[PDB]
Structures are given as structure tokens and as C-alpha cells.
Design a protein around this ligand. Structure first.
Ligand SMILES: CN(C)C[C@@H]1CC[N+]2=C(C1)/C(=C1/C(=O)NC(=O)/C1=C1\C=[N+](C)c3ccccc31)c1ccccc12
Length: 326
């Protein structure tokens, strides 16, 4: 379409995902989140293939309820734009800061929806690789939304393996740290780290610097507090198996774990289960549920290196455009 069809109200955030704005369709008064990338910055960072994978993965996302939905993708001479579902309900990291840890039934419900979201991605041959509490958003009813598909690997059906060193320090799998070829097993390790943090309110591994933390991930036994529910410990013990082919999620059937005894997986995937908690949100402009760091910055697209833009190959971002049905 055209970015002029939108009024950019706020910068929600800025970072490894580029820039994301609170945007209103002029015109209809519907609010969206818009991820904006500079094409010259993408080429400098050597991230052209990254951008295309993210767009292709986001193209599939409307098929599942627990992934952030993308409505459309379009480009300018300088810019790439992704028009997304707007979620101001807050991320799980932000929410956990207030309460320290989630109660067992709340953590169990988030774990179960994340399982459904991850298993959907793996069935499409996608390894997600960036699972973390910051990437889990709440919709207005309190169901989860997995966000940020910028680290995904795309052709991972059956026996397929990859090699890249990708992740966030606390959540990175030991097989990545040992330089091994890996599959979706790494997502189930990160899932364990995320579950552990929800239940306990600390990371399972520790170190004063990245190096000591990597050693902890490879060597240490996570601490399980005396009060922790038996089945919750048992699930964690089964995900924190360092041999990938023996980890729950890769082997066995994680849905059948006694922790999820009371989960009807069919009803959950249809959103027929009452969320344990619902964010309080007065309007699209209510920013009570997320980090306010960038909200007073002018909601502007910054200047590009005109020289690089007018000289670069223009067809690197072809097949970028996409329209979600209706
Ligand atoms: C920063 N983090 C805790 C998250 C993830 C940070 C990752 N991320 C979020 C998420 C995110 C979304 C989204 O899909 N729908 C959103 O409303 C949205 C938000 C909302 N908020 C309020 C927001 C702040 C900064 C950046 C992005 C976003 C998004 C879109 C494209 C690429 C990466 C993201």
C-alpha cells in the first residue's frame, strides 16, 4: 500500500527488530503495529535474507491463534514495512517484574499455549530460536502471542539440521554452545528456561559474564525449590536433558506430561479456555503494560544513505510484498 495511509502516533520500541510504531489507518481508525526497516541499514548489517525469512514466516502466522498476525507487507525505495496486529497488553517479562513469578496454574496455561505455538511452527519446518519471556505478548483476553520471527530457520523438515550460533544468552541451548548441528530441540531447551523463569522468577543458569554463563548452561544442575510442584520439576528435569535427541519435545509427547493433565488441547487451541489473567487496557493509547523507553521519541522514519540506496541492486527485496486474505 502506502505508509501515508497511516498516522504514526508513537514509537513503541527500537532495537534488533528495527523500529515498531503505533499506527492508525487514517481512514478507518484501526490501530496496527508497524515494523519499519531501512533497506541500506539492512544491507550494511548483511541481513537481507533475515528480512525475507521473517516475511515468509509472518506470511504463515495468520493460520495460528498464538502467533502475532501480519496483515500486509510493502516496500518503498528506502523502506520495508510490515503491518502487524497491535498488542498493548504487555509482554510476559514486563508482567513478571510486577509479581516476581507466576502462580502454577497461570504458568501452566502459558506453557501450554506456547507448546501449541511452537509445535505449529515446527510442523511448517520452522525453528524459532529466539524463545524468551520478552517475545511473548498478551492479547486483550490474556491468550499468548509469540512475536519476533527475525531469528527463524526455514527448511527444517525431518532430518534437516543447521549450524548458526543464534540466541539470547540465558536461553541458548547447550548443543548450540558446543557448535553442533541442531534442529527444533533448541526451542525445547529455551522452553524449559522460560518455564523455569515463570515458575521460579530467576534464570536457571548463572554467571558473572557471558563465558561463565555458557559454562553454567553446559554443566550446572538447575535449582528446584522445596515448594515446587513435583510435576513441574519433573517436566523441567525432562527438558533440561543436554542430549537433544533425549529431550521432551523432541522425543515422547509433551502434551501427555502430567503437568498438563487437566488441559484439553483441542479447546485450548480454539481459545475456549479462560485465561488466568487479562491485561487492563483503557484504549490503544494506554501504555501501562509495556516499557515506556521510546514513547516520547518523534515517530519518525530516519534518513537513509541516499548514495547506497541509489546504487544498490533494487531486486534484493522482490517477492517481499504480501496481503493477508481480506
Ligand atoms: C520489546 N518487547 C518486550 C516486545 C516485542 C519485541 C519484538 N516484536 C514485538 C513485541 C512486536 C509486536 C507485534 O507483533 N505487535 C505488537 O504490538 C508488537 C509490539 C508491542 N509493543 C509494546 C512493542 C514494543 C516494541 C517493539 C514491538 C512491540 C514485533 C513486530 C515485528 C517484529 C518484532 C516485534
Amino acid at each position: 500500500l502506502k505508509i501515508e495511509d497511516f498516522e504514526l502516533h508513537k514509537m513503541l520500541g527500537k532495537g534488533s527488530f528495527g523500529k515498531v510504531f503505533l499506527a492508525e489507518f487514517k481512514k478507518t481508525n484501526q490501530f496496527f503495529a508497524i515494523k519499519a526497516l531501512k533497506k541500506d541499514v539492512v544491507l550494511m548489517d548483511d541481513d537481507v535474507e533475515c528480512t525475507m525469512v521473517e516475511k515468509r514466516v509472518l506470511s504463515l502466522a495468520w493460520e495460528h491463534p498464538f502467533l502475532t498476525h501480519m496483515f500486509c507487507t510493502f516496500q518503498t525505495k528506502e523502506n520495508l514495512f510490515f503491518v502487524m496486529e497491535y498488542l498493548n497488553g504487555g509482554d510476559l517479562m514486563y508482567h513478571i517484574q510486577s509479581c516476581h513469578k507466576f502462580d502454577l496454574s497461570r504458568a501452566t496455561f502459558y506453557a501450554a499455549e506456547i507448546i501449541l505455538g511452537l509445535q505449529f511452527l515446527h510442523s511448517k519446518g520452522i525453528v524459532y530460536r529466539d524463545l524468551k519471556l520478552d517475545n511473548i505478548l498478551l492479547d486483550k483476553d490474556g491468550h499468548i502471542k509469540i512475536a519476533d520471527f527475525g531469528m527463524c530457520k526455514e527448511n527444517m523438515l525431518g532430518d534437516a539440521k543447521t549450524n548458526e550460533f543464534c540466541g539470547t544468552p540465558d536461553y541458548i541451548a547447550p548443543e548450540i554452545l558446543l557448535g553442533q548441528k541442531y534442529n527444533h530441540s533448541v526451542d525445547w531447551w529455551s522452553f524449559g528456561v522460560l518455564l523455569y523463569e515463570m515458575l521460579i522468577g530467576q534464570s536457571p543458569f548463572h554467571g558473572q559474564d557471558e563465558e561463565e554463563l555458557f559454562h553454567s548452561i553446559r554443566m550446572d544442575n538447575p535449582f528446584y525449590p522445596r515448594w515446587l510442584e513435583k510435576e513441574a520439576k519433573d517436566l523441567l528435569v525432562k527438558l533440561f536433558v543436554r542430549e537433544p535427541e533425549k529431550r521432551l519435545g523432541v522425543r515422547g509427547d509433551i502434551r501427555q506430561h502430567p503437568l498438563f493433565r487437566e488441559i484439553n488441547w483441542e479447546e485450548l487451541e480454539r481459545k475456549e479456555i479462560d485465561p488466568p489473567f487479562r491485561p487492563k487496557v483503557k484504549s490503544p493509547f494506554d501504555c501501562s503494560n509495556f516499557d515506556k523507553e521510546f514513547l516520547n521519541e518523534k515517530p519518525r522514519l530516519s534518513f537513509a544513505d541516499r548514495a547506497l540506496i541509489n546504487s544498490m541492486d533494487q531486486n534484493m527485496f522482490r517477492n517481499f510484498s504480501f496481503m493477508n486474505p481480506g
